[PDB]
Design a protein around this nucleic acid. Structure first.
Lengths: 63, 41
RNA sequence: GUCAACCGAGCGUUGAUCCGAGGAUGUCCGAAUGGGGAAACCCGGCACGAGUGAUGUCGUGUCACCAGGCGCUGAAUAUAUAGGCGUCUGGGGGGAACGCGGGGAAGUGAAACAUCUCAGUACCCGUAGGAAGAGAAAACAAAAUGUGAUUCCGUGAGUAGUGGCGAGCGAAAGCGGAGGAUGGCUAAACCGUAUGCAUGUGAUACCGGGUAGGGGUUGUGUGUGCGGGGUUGUGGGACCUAUCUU
RNA sequence: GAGCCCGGUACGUGAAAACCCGACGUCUGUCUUGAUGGUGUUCCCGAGUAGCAGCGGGCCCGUGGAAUCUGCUGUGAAUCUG
RNA sequence: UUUGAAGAAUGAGCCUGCGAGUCAGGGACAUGUCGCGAGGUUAACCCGGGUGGGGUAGCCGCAGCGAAAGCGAGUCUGAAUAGGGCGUAUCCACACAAGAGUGUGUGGUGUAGUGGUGUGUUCUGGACCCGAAGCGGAGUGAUCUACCCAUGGCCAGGGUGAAGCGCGGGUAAGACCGCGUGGAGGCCCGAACCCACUUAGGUUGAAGACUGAGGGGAUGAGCUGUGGGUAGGGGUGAAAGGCCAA
RNA sequence: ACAGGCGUAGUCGAUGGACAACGGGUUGAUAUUCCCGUACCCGUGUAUGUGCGUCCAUGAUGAAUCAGCGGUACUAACCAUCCAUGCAUGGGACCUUCGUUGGUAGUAGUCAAGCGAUGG
RNA sequence: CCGGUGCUGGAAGGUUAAGAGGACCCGUUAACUCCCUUUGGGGGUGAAGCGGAGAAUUUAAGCCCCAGUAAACGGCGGUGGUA
RNA sequence: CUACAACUUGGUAUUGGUGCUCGAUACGGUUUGUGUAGGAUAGGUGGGAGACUGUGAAGCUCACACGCCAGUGUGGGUGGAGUCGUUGUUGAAAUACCACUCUGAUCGUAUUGGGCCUCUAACCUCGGACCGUAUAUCCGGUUCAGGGACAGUGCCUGGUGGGU
RNA sequence: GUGUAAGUGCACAAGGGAGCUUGACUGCGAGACGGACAUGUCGAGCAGGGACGAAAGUCGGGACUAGUGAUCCGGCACCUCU
């Protein structure tokens, strides 16, 4: 849910600054979506984890 | 996306008619069963 | 060999003991990898041999998993895929320090403490190499008709600044040196060629002009592969188009 | 308590074999179907990228008027009068 | 350590060894000492088998005032030569002014810093040494103990007499009542076994939790054997802030 | 995110299940282990004898053809209901189809020694 | 005993985040308009573009609000006279 | 006191179609314009001296609208040969034609959100059946059956929050 | 009696009344008091421009001593600073 199966996009690490400036560790996970793609026009469908950026790029083939 | 329709699709147009369509519709209905082709030339 | 002698036996001028280089042997455990297991101990398959009146027994090879090539087959299922089978090449673990990329504390100081510091330290994770990383300007600079990849050392400087403007933190430009390779290769526009996928005015169409054929160097597209051509900042290169031509 | 007793020191010498450095070669690619300086126009110069917005990291810079660099999420261009 | 302790405030059985203001930085201030002196001095680095030679990049002096533009022996504020702040090393002499404290000018006199190094402090480093309860990171522990899972074992002996069943009485039939058979129960007494209520001993013990007398449970919510599981801000807990290797 | 957390097929894991030995003697130390006497349990080879089977032969059987008839029921029809004549409905039968039996084809076929599951 | 605090149910209203929204204003200057002087600066207006703050409007839960709930946490009185 | 886990609200991405139902501005627009000087509920500027007409005008009857019911507009019927102008009012003309539009209810073309009922393809199913498979209540694939643009998840954001 | 606590003063008035007025100023300030330091207090006099008065002259708030908060951070107005 944090590593893209296409481009390997991974979560980012940072801090959650509060009003009193208390910095606490937190994570920025990628927008991973489970998509059943069609690797070849033959019709085989496989469930892969692709980020929404990959879907926008058309790199995944949900035919 | 900009694309050229292949066959008669109702509420869109006749074959040979170019239409602008939302991403979800084109990617999940038109392209998979060849009712629309992306515009190249 | 030695502690570490005491015997008992023997070798050496035909070169011993000893030193250096290269080989052979190298039980079992250990990534341990035929299976198992409480590490160094239990149980096997296959093939070829040894042995027995025959079973028992012995010896030598081979038999883990994963990844990537190559070949065969292609489930549900129709195209096909998953998967299965066989065969080759790799990986696995260990190491004191140094490197890179991530995750990342608290005791402490602030005479309390939360922003801050400690500190991106301690530690953990993934990885290399003999070094690693960076490296060839989408750079600095300020009107100097200026430098010219990166890296490292000294200054700049505890400065400009930053900070509950508190404790503290803290550059860069420029200058001086070490080393020098101000280094190379590509992608695109265009050609040529092969192939996949669609079709084809299926002919007056594609070769550089003029002659004559012909209905496909496909005719047209589109994608990919390969070979040419192109490596740039005063823009450069393709498309052209004259001149000269080792 | 040694220069002249010994091992040695200054100084010269030594490699069958293995390995490491060079050098000259076989070998490999490569240019020669090539090279020069000129003239006016169309195409190309790295895309889910740059830019922008939200939340963060790190820069002297603790979000501050906050530039350059960078992570995630949306949005998303131009090819040189860029 | 004390206002004050010969001690009835603290520490020391004795001896011999060991045990506490140290180092780094062209750091900061002060003070000796040496070189040079309106100049002093090099860092990195290069060349010397050395302690030597080179190295002008910088640094400190050389002009101050002002937030700054800027001006400059002056400058800032200011409408102001109108006073004040800072500065022109310091002294001397001469004038002219005032006796609101002395000033304003003319000549002379001419200005001393910097780099080594010793010493005393001081900054950052554990910083004179010794001494906590406790806080974080990563690991090790359920062979003791808490609970649970799988699979086995043990509970001498003696009592009481439930359901049910049979026979008889009884009734229209029952209900019900007697007599037998039956052997139930977190049942009774009491050994093994498991606990630990009282008392005495022990208390530099036989024992870092026992012993002698008595005491409670003892067919169960029982005890126990072997194997296994739950791990630290977590476990487990018939709940005591209990136990998790004295 | 990574480190790693679970877990399928499997494979381990007795404290359990299965599984053939008893009495005596001896040594300075071992003894259901060595010896004595008598057994029991797995395999191997040789030989002998009964007694089945393949090849041979004998049994056991049964499947399918054409043709001979009645009920499902392609479809046209009849009866009744019947919506307004039409249909739907229900019932008899046509064709196909399904069921019975005379020839064939207990002949070609399968099985009949013995082992027998990784399966029930 | 539902006055307080919880819990449950309900929004007719008040308030309310991000996101949508970009009035108005400001910075820059193409273009002008006034000087004031001699060997181009000094005043104003200022399109478009690019930016910077950004308003009116829309918006959910929650809170305020309307009721129930005590085998929910909790609470359950004084003074004077009188046979 | 300050934070966080957790739960929860909304926006946005994954995320799509057809219809109803509402609101904003754009376009062809109808529509509304009561000082009084008066044929009189003059929107001002315009090209503005003749224009509509028989693609059937005056005079009349109906429907609707508002209604200051002052009366006007549209639609239809009726009738068949008129209104009008600097006609004189006036800053301001004719309601004679033509070229946007302002106060204002409307229509058809856009865009845009808001809500509602649906559809299936995204996505989901610890619902069924087959296959990998000899063993498989794992997993994956195919298919059937259901939900379905909801949920889940990513980024942003408001609440409850001694649980830490 | 002195606005207000008390004290020190004020009848020469600082107490009471009337006229005009805004010095309840700008740039400064010799010299002092008190004090660890930071604070705090008095001040003659000079210049500008004013008020009152015929004039001399007085006026940099109130008879005096209480009515107040350093630093950092930020707002507003002006400046011939950057």
């Amino acid at each position: 849910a944090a590593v893209c199966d296409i481009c390997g996009k991974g979560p980012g690490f940072g801090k959650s600054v509060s009003h009193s400036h208390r910095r606490t560790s937190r994570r920025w996970n990628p927008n991973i979506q489970p998509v059943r793609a069609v690797t070849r026009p033959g019709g085989n469908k496989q469930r892969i984890n692709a980020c929404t950026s990959c879907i926008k790029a058309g790199k995944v083939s949900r035919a | 996306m900009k694309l050229i329709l292949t066959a008669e699709v109702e509420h869109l147009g006749a074959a040979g008619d170019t239409v602008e369509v939302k991403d979800g519709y084109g990617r999940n209905y038109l392209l998979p069963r060849g009712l629309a082709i992306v515009a190249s030339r």
